[PDB]
């Protein structure tokens, strides 16, 4: 009976919550109470990157911690040099409606996608000296919210069709499709070891996935609205989520439950982008109120605020060496903070 | 200068890239962006046919004016996540079928098709991302509405309607009902045009509406407001 199946699902959900409540012997706040507070963190805008003529929707950092790519609705995907504010490349796009961009770890490729539901892979290093479309990945039935590179041949894409995918670039086919989200997936974050990745969707749920098998090991709940940004802790045993309910939450995979929430009464707007510092102590979240607040991971205290963007900060990124963090905003500007 | 030879050449490449970006941005600013919306088989395809995946982009030039029309009828996702990408469009072309009053929606008979069109219009007109964007309202299927209004009355869609079965009164009532959905009447203005399959002046109506929008925008820019 369908009612019997629903009752069984409810019983399994009660078992899950009972087990999680059993594992909650002591919260993060009590354990990290004695830690010396981080203190106020003031970060000046070292570089401002100008040249975008529309809202900046995406931004990613190369592995070298110097070259970054930026995506905007002007139809262009600019690779910047952070140290010297030079434009290494400017890539025209067939579709100007882009929402995400990626930088390959090898740095040879850059991926871009958006409302066309196509992940376009761009070959930066070519004999002809120009950036060219290498592969147009098709198959999704909704807007691409985020794409991240595993290596030169594998890429993970999250779409508005409630399905994440892992592509094999050489053949342009879907190696495995991830299903289980009721709402549209809005962000994904690969583990540093690259065998798992977290997907945050509009169902207020974040799900762990195994890239090789295709099953969802854990599903995380607690948010009251759409999760816009997700990010892995540097360890890979934890991740943070940014939602529209103006709260950021830190989950751990092994304990399978949330640890604590990053919320303030003054903050009403939803978190658009989230990021972590190299040590994981600082949680940088880009808010819709033209601000980017830096939090403390182990204590709910807010260390500092990075102001300087006229419009909504749409993307965030901390370098691999952790020295600089970039805030891209709808006001057509990029800023490097240190 | 304290710059190497290749450093200077890299800066020169950056300046050339900046020049190309400036020219492309000026070209884009010269262009007119229209967002095309409709509910079901409202005639959106027909009006696309007259003028000339997720987004179907159509470009055309009419009277030295370059037109971008974006169609998002195939997205089938949460509209609030991607509706802010279209903030800044010159005008929103809303397509509504007049014959939908008699027909009921495919999914369940509880909801009438025209009521779903009204709900979409209320969500789009009153959205916070489109507070200053004018709307071009295309009411299609005039021949179908003429044929239907004789056989079936407008009271089925509108029980409060107490008027003649003639085309003019019913069309005026439908247009007035759609125009009342504009809460911010001061910020925007809605242009309504009655079109059919054989109509050939829809492009002219769109051109006039965009001309008015450009006039108002540059009045605001010039300080006259």
């Amino acid at each position, epitope marked *: 009976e369908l009612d019997q199946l629903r009752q069984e699902a409810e019983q399994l959900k009660n078992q899950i919550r009972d087990a999680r409540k059993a594992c909650a012997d002591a919260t993060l706040s009590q354990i990290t109470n004695n830690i010396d507070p981080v203190g106020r963190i003031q970060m000046r805008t070292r570089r401002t990157l100008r040249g975008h003529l529309a809202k900046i929707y995406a931004m990613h950092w190369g592995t070298d911690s110097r070259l970054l790519v930026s995506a905007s609705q002007d139809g262009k995907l600019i690779i910047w040099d952070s140290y010297t504010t030079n434009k290494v490349h400017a890539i025209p796009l067939r579709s100007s409606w882009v929402m995400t961009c990626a930088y390959a770890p090898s740095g040879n490729y850059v991926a871009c996608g958006g409302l066309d539901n196509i992940c376009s892979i761009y070959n930066l290093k070519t004999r002809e000296g120009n950036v060219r479309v290498s592969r147009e990945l098709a198959g999704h039935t909704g807007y691409l919210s985020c794409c991240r590179f595993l290596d030169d041949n594998q890429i993970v894409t999250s779409s508005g069709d409630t399905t994440c995918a892992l592509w094999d670039i050489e053949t342009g086919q879907q190696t495995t499709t991830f299903t289980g989200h009721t709402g549209d997936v809005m962000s994904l974050s690969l583990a540093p070891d690259t065998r798992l990745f977290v997907s945050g969707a509009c169902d207020a749920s974040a799900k762990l996935w195994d890239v090789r098998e295709g099953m969802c090991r854990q599903t995380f709940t607690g948010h009251e609205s759409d999760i816009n940004a997700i990010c892995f802790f540097p360890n890979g045993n934890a991740f943070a989520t940014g939602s529209d309910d103006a709260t950021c939450r830190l989950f751990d995979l092994r304990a399978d439950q949330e640890l604590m929430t990053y919320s303030h009464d003054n903050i009403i707007c939803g978190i658009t982008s989230v990021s972590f510092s190299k040590s994981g102590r600082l949680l940088l979240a880009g808010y819709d109120d033209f601000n980017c607040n830096v939090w403390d991971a182990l204590k709910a205290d807010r260390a500092g605020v990075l102001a300087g963007h006229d419009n909504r900060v749409s993307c965030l990124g901390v370098t691999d060496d952790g020295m600089a963090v970039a805030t891209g905003s709808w006001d057509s500007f990029l800023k490097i903070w240190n | 200068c304290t710059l190497s030879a290749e450093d200077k050449a890299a800066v020169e*490449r950056s300046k*050339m890239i900046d020049r190309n970006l400036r020219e492309d941005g000026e070209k884009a600013a010269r262009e007119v962006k229209l967002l095309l919306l409709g509910a079901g088989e409202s005639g959106k395809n027909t009006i696309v046919k007259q003028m000339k995946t997720g987004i179907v982009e159509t470009h055309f030039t009419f009277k030295d004016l370059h037109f971008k029309m974006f169609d998002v009828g195939a997205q089938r996702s949460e509209r609030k996540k991607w509706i802010h990408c279209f903030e800044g469009v010159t005008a929103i072309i809303f397509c509504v079928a007049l014959s939908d009053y008699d027909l009921v929606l495919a999914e369940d008979e509880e909801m009438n098709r025209m009521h779903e069109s009204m709900k979409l219009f209320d969500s789009i007109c009153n959205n916070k991302w489109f507070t200053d964007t004018s709307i071009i309202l295309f009411l299609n299927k005039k021949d179908l509405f003429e044929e239907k209004i004789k056989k079936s009355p407008l009271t089925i869609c509108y029980p409060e309607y107490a008027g003649s079965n003639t085309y003019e009164e019913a069309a005026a009532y439908i247009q007035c009902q759609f125009e009342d959905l504009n809460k911010r009447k001061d910020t925007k203005e809605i242009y309504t045009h009655f079109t059919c399959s054989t109509d050939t002046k829809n492009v002219q109506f769109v051109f006039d509406a965009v001309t008015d929008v450009i006039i108002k925008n540059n009045l605001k820019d010039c300080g006259l407001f």
Partner: single-chain antibody, 232 residues
Framework: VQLVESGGGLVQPGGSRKLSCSASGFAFSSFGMHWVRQAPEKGLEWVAYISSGSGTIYYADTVKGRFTISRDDPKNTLFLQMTSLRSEDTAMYYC??????????????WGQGTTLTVSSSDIVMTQATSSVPVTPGESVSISCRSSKSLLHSNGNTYLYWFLQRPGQSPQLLIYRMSNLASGVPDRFSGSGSGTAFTLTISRLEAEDVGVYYCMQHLEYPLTFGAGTKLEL
């Protein structure tokens, strides 16, 4: 990618000729372009350089005034107009492409060469040996020296290595003293202390015979080395 060069021919002293380099297979507008001269029995010497968009143009002191370099982007060709020729210019002329961004590989591709026959504070690079016997399968180190330090404040040391096989145009081996060029076998490697630099080949095949030149890019009067010849 190809750079076919036309021109040359017998020229009387004091005459004038035009050299045309035709580009096919790459974005000509993006690449900065150079002209390099190789004497019939001597090494390479820089002549002129034109940047992307013709923004900046630099000549050597020898050909300053007499020579002018211009490019035609729409027709994908590069022009070198020579006037007041002398017996100092009788040589083979090379048309070399160079692109300049972060991580780029300048002097990547070289043209075949066209022969011009005339009838009858700059950094100094020294490669002392100029000829060394070698055995296949062994390891060889080639040394070059610079009058001034090639290390800039940005941390980039601008030294370039080129291989000129017998009857073949120069091919880039190492750019900026450590980075292997695209397609060059991994056996080659480079190292240096900022004033003196070495190029090391772990193993030698029959393809490695040729003359190796050390070039500098710190200041635009680019001076090539005399060259070291490896013969078995």
């Amino acid at each position: 990618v190809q750079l076919v060069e036309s021109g040359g021919g017998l020229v009387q002293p004091g005459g004038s000729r035009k050299l045309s380099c035709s580009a096919s297979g790459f974005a000509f507008s993006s690449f900065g372009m150079h002209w390099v001269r190789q004497a019939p029995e001597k090494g390479l010497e820089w002549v002129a350089y034109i940047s992307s968009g013709s923004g900046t143009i630099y000549y050597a002191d020898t050909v300053k005034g007499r020579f002018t370099i211009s490019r035609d982007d729409p027709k994908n060709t590069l022009f070198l107009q020579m006037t007041s020729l002398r017996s100092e210019d009788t040589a083979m002329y090379y048309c070399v492409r160079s692109i300049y961004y972060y991580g780029s590989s300048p002097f990547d591709f070289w043209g075949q060469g066209t022969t011009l026959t005339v009838s009858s504070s700059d950094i100094v690079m020294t490669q002392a040996t100029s000829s060394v016997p070698v055995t296949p399968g062994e390891s060889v180190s080639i040394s070059c020296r610079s009058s001034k330090s090639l290390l800039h404040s940005n941390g980039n040391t601008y030294l370039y290595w080129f291989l000129q096989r017998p009857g073949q145009s120069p091919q880039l081996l190492i750019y900026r003293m450590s980075n292997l060029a695209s397609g060059v076998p991994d056996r080659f490697s480079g190292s240096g202390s900022g004033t003196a630099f070495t190029l090391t080949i772990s193993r030698l095949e029959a393809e490695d015979v040729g003359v190796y030149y050390c070039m500098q890019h710190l200041e635009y009067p680019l001076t090539f080395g005399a060259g070291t010849k490896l013969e078995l």
